[PDB]
Amino acid sequence: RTISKAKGPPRIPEVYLLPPPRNELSKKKVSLTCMITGFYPADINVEWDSSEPSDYKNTPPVFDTDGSFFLYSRLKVDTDAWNNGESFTCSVMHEALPNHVIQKSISRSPG
Amino acid sequence: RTISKAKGPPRIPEVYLLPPPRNELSKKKVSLTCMITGFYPADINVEWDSSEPSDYKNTPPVFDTDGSFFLYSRLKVDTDAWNNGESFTCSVMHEALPNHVIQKSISRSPG
Numbered sequence: 193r194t195i196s197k198a199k200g201p202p203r204i205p206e207v208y209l210l211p212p213p214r215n216e217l218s219k220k221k222v223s224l225t226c227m228i229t230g231f232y233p234a235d236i237n238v239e240w241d242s243s244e245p246s247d248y249k250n251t252p253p254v255f256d257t258d259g260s261f262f263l264y265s266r267l268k269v270d271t272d273a274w275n276n277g278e279s280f281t282c283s284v285m286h287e288a289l290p291n292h293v294i295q296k297s298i299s300r301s302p303g
Numbered sequence: 304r305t306i307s308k309a310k311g312p313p314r315i316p317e318v319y320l321l322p323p324p325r326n327e328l329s330k331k332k333v334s335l336t337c338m339i340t341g342f343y344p345a346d347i348n349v350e351w352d353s354s355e356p357s358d359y360k361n362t363p364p365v366f367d368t369d370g371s372f373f374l375y376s377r378l379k380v381d382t383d384a385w386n387n388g389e390s391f392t393c394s395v396m397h398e399a400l401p402n403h404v405i406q407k408s409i410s411r412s413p414g
Contacts, residue, residue: 204332206328206332206333208326208333209324209325209326210321210324210335210336211324211325213320213321213322213324214320214322214410215319215320217317221315221317221340221341222317222319224321225321229332230332246367246368247367247368247370249365249367250365251362251363251365251375252362252363252365254360254361254362254363254377256357256358256360256379257357257358259358264362264375266365268367299325
Protein backbone atom coordinates (compact mmCIF):
# COMPACT_ATOMS: atom_id res chain seq x y z
CA ARG A 193 0.00 0.00 0.00
CA THR A 194 2.19 2.77 -1.44
CA ILE A 195 3.04 4.55 -4.69
CA SER A 196 4.78 7.81 -5.80
CA LYS A 197 3.16 10.11 -8.35
CA ALA A 198 1.85 12.50 -10.81
CA LYS A 199 1.19 16.18 -10.57
CA GLY A 200 2.38 15.86 -7.10
CA PRO A 201 1.59 14.12 -3.92
CA PRO A 202 4.56 15.45 -1.91
CA ARG A 203 5.25 19.09 -2.74
CA ILE A 204 3.19 22.09 -1.55
CA PRO A 205 4.94 23.10 1.74
CA GLU A 206 2.68 25.04 4.20
CA VAL A 207 0.49 25.34 7.35
CA TYR A 208 -2.44 27.64 8.55
CA LEU A 209 -4.34 29.84 10.97
CA LEU A 210 -7.83 31.39 11.09
CA PRO A 211 -8.57 33.07 14.50
CA PRO A 212 -11.68 34.65 15.96
CA PRO A 213 -11.93 37.87 13.96
CA ARG A 214 -14.12 40.96 13.60
CA ASN A 215 -17.43 39.16 14.25
CA GLU A 216 -19.99 40.13 16.88
CA LEU A 217 -21.59 37.34 18.99
CA SER A 218 -22.55 36.26 22.49
CA LYS A 219 -21.15 32.93 23.79
CA LYS A 220 -22.46 30.19 21.37
CA LYS A 221 -21.87 29.61 17.55
CA VAL A 222 -18.66 30.93 15.89
CA SER A 223 -15.56 28.61 15.70
CA LEU A 224 -12.27 28.19 13.79
CA THR A 225 -9.77 25.91 12.09
CA CYS A 226 -6.40 24.59 10.98
CA MET A 227 -5.55 24.26 7.27
CA ILE A 228 -3.05 21.98 5.57
CA THR A 229 -3.23 21.61 1.95
CA GLY A 230 -2.01 21.15 -1.53
CA PHE A 231 -0.67 17.55 -1.24
CA TYR A 232 -1.20 14.11 -2.58
CA PRO A 233 -0.90 11.27 -2.47
CA ALA A 234 -4.24 10.09 -1.08
CA ASP A 235 -3.67 10.26 2.65
CA ILE A 236 -2.58 12.44 5.55
CA ASN A 237 -4.14 12.76 9.06
CA VAL A 238 -4.92 15.53 11.45
CA GLU A 239 -5.27 15.54 15.18
CA TRP A 240 -5.61 18.68 17.30
CA ASP A 241 -4.14 18.63 20.71
CA SER A 242 -4.48 14.88 21.12
CA SER A 243 -7.68 15.23 23.25
CA GLU A 244 -11.09 15.99 21.89
CA PRO A 245 -13.68 18.03 23.83
CA SER A 246 -16.98 18.37 22.16
CA ASP A 247 -16.20 19.29 18.56
CA TYR A 248 -12.91 18.45 16.81
CA LYS A 249 -13.78 17.00 13.48
CA ASN A 250 -11.83 17.09 10.14
CA THR A 251 -13.02 18.85 6.96
CA PRO A 252 -12.55 16.40 4.11
CA PRO A 253 -10.27 16.65 1.08
CA VAL A 254 -11.30 19.34 -1.39
CA PHE A 255 -8.66 19.18 -4.19
CA ASP A 256 -8.37 22.06 -6.65
CA THR A 257 -7.63 22.02 -10.23
CA ASP A 258 -4.02 22.35 -9.74
CA GLY A 259 -4.99 22.14 -6.13
CA SER A 260 -2.82 18.84 -5.45
CA PHE A 261 -4.62 18.54 -2.01
CA PHE A 262 -6.80 20.38 0.44
CA LEU A 263 -7.46 19.57 4.07
CA TYR A 264 -9.09 21.70 6.71
CA SER A 265 -9.75 20.69 10.35
CA ARG A 266 -11.69 22.52 13.11
CA LEU A 267 -12.16 23.18 16.77
CA LYS A 268 -14.74 24.62 19.10
CA VAL A 269 -15.35 24.41 22.93
CA ASP A 270 -18.74 26.09 22.62
CA THR A 271 -18.46 29.57 24.19
CA ASP A 272 -17.60 31.49 27.38
CA ALA A 273 -14.79 29.11 28.38
CA TRP A 274 -11.83 30.04 26.31
CA ASN A 275 -8.74 31.42 27.97
CA ASN A 276 -7.21 28.53 30.11
CA GLY A 277 -9.90 26.04 29.33
CA GLU A 278 -7.99 25.04 26.22
CA SER A 279 -5.48 27.73 25.14
CA PHE A 280 -5.04 25.36 22.14
CA THR A 281 -3.14 23.45 19.42
CA CYS A 282 -2.94 21.91 15.89
CA SER A 283 -0.99 18.95 14.60
CA VAL A 284 -0.28 17.45 11.27
CA MET A 285 1.44 14.31 10.15
CA HIS A 286 1.00 13.36 6.56
CA GLU A 287 2.56 10.09 5.68
CA ALA A 288 3.18 9.17 2.02
CA LEU A 289 6.32 10.73 3.17
CA PRO A 290 6.58 12.00 6.63
CA ASN A 291 6.28 15.57 7.62
CA HIS A 292 5.37 16.10 11.33
CA VAL A 293 4.44 19.63 12.11
CA ILE A 294 3.15 21.68 14.88
CA GLN A 295 1.89 25.25 15.00
CA LYS A 296 -0.27 26.78 17.75
CA SER A 297 -2.37 29.53 19.40
CA ILE A 298 -5.07 32.22 19.16
CA SER A 299 -5.16 35.99 20.09
CA ARG A 300 -8.55 37.78 19.95
CA SER A 301 -11.95 35.98 20.17
CA PRO A 302 -15.65 36.22 21.20
CA GLY A 303 -14.32 39.68 22.17
CA ARG B 304 -39.39 15.69 -1.54
CA THR B 305 -39.85 17.43 1.82
CA ILE B 306 -40.28 16.75 5.54
CA SER B 307 -40.04 18.71 8.86
CA LYS B 308 -38.07 17.32 11.79
CA ALA B 309 -36.27 16.20 14.79
CA LYS B 310 -33.57 17.85 16.80
CA GLY B 311 -33.84 20.59 14.36
CA PRO B 312 -33.45 21.28 10.74
CA PRO B 313 -34.51 24.96 10.85
CA ARG B 314 -33.15 26.68 13.95
CA ILE B 315 -29.53 27.78 14.50
CA PRO B 316 -29.51 31.40 13.17
CA GLU B 317 -26.02 32.67 12.06
CA VAL B 318 -23.38 33.57 9.43
CA TYR B 319 -19.47 33.82 9.31
CA LEU B 320 -16.13 35.39 8.49
CA LEU B 321 -12.48 34.25 8.54
CA PRO B 322 -10.11 36.86 6.95
CA PRO B 323 -6.41 36.80 6.13
CA PRO B 324 -4.86 37.02 9.59
CA ARG B 325 -1.45 37.10 11.29
CA ASN B 326 0.24 34.69 8.86
CA GLU B 327 3.45 35.40 6.94
CA LEU B 328 3.61 34.40 3.23
CA SER B 329 4.58 35.54 -0.25
CA LYS B 330 1.89 35.48 -2.99
CA LYS B 331 0.74 31.79 -3.29
CA LYS B 332 -0.98 29.38 -0.74
CA VAL B 333 -3.13 30.84 2.11
CA SER B 334 -6.94 31.33 1.51
CA LEU B 335 -10.21 31.79 3.44
CA THR B 336 -13.89 30.97 3.83
CA CYS B 337 -17.55 31.54 4.62
CA MET B 338 -19.31 29.49 7.32
CA ILE B 339 -22.98 28.68 7.71
CA THR B 340 -23.94 26.08 10.08
CA GLY B 341 -26.01 24.32 12.61
CA PHE B 342 -29.05 23.44 10.42
CA TYR B 343 -30.95 20.53 9.08
CA PRO B 344 -32.79 19.32 7.25
CA ALA B 345 -30.53 17.69 4.67
CA ASP B 346 -29.97 20.49 2.19
CA ILE B 347 -28.85 24.09 1.74
CA ASN B 348 -26.59 25.59 -0.99
CA VAL B 349 -23.81 28.08 -1.15
CA GLU B 350 -22.62 30.27 -3.96
CA TRP B 351 -20.02 33.03 -3.57
CA ASP B 352 -20.37 36.03 -5.73
CA SER B 353 -22.16 34.19 -8.52
CA SER B 354 -18.95 33.88 -10.62
CA GLU B 355 -16.18 31.44 -9.98
CA PRO B 356 -12.51 32.23 -10.72
CA SER B 357 -10.15 29.42 -10.09
CA ASP B 358 -11.11 28.04 -6.68
CA TYR B 359 -14.58 28.40 -5.15
CA LYS B 360 -15.55 25.02 -3.86
CA ASN B 361 -17.83 24.05 -0.89
CA THR B 362 -16.67 22.23 2.27
CA PRO B 363 -19.15 19.44 2.89
CA PRO B 364 -21.52 18.94 5.81
CA VAL B 365 -19.77 18.13 9.08
CA PHE B 366 -22.60 17.78 11.67
CA ASP B 367 -21.77 17.85 15.37
CA THR B 368 -23.25 15.96 18.14
CA ASP B 369 -25.75 18.52 18.87
CA GLY B 370 -24.24 20.16 15.87
CA SER B 371 -27.66 20.16 13.80
CA PHE B 372 -25.59 21.18 10.66
CA PHE B 373 -22.23 22.43 9.52
CA LEU B 374 -21.30 23.95 6.19
CA TYR B 375 -18.16 25.79 5.23
CA SER B 376 -17.34 27.22 1.77
CA ARG B 377 -14.09 28.79 0.45
CA LEU B 378 -12.45 31.21 -1.91
CA LYS B 379 -9.04 31.94 -3.31
CA VAL B 380 -7.76 33.94 -6.39
CA ASP B 381 -4.22 32.64 -5.92
CA THR B 382 -2.04 35.57 -4.77
CA ASP B 383 -0.83 39.08 -5.66
CA ALA B 384 -4.15 40.13 -7.22
CA TRP B 385 -6.43 40.99 -4.39
CA ASN B 386 -7.64 44.54 -3.97
CA ASN B 387 -9.97 45.32 -7.01
CA GLY B 388 -9.50 42.00 -8.68
CA GLU B 389 -12.33 40.60 -6.59
CA SER B 390 -13.00 42.72 -3.47
CA PHE B 391 -15.44 39.85 -2.69
CA THR B 392 -18.69 38.23 -1.46
CA CYS B 393 -20.59 35.31 0.17
CA SER B 394 -24.13 34.10 -0.30
CA VAL B 395 -26.37 31.62 1.33
CA MET B 396 -29.78 30.29 0.56
CA HIS B 397 -30.87 27.26 2.47
CA GLU B 398 -34.18 25.93 1.40
CA ALA B 399 -36.09 23.48 3.63
CA LEU B 400 -37.36 26.82 4.55
CA PRO B 401 -35.99 29.82 2.91
CA ASN B 402 -33.46 32.11 4.40
CA HIS B 403 -31.53 34.22 1.81
CA VAL B 404 -28.59 35.98 3.26
CA ILE B 405 -25.72 38.05 2.25
CA GLN B 406 -22.65 39.22 4.14
CA LYS B 407 -19.41 40.52 2.58
CA SER B 408 -15.79 41.76 2.63
CA ILE B 409 -12.19 41.42 3.85
CA SER B 410 -9.73 43.88 5.57
CA ARG B 411 -6.08 42.76 5.99
CA SER B 412 -4.41 40.02 3.85
CA PRO B 413 -1.13 38.67 2.35
CA GLY B 414 0.05 41.82 4.17
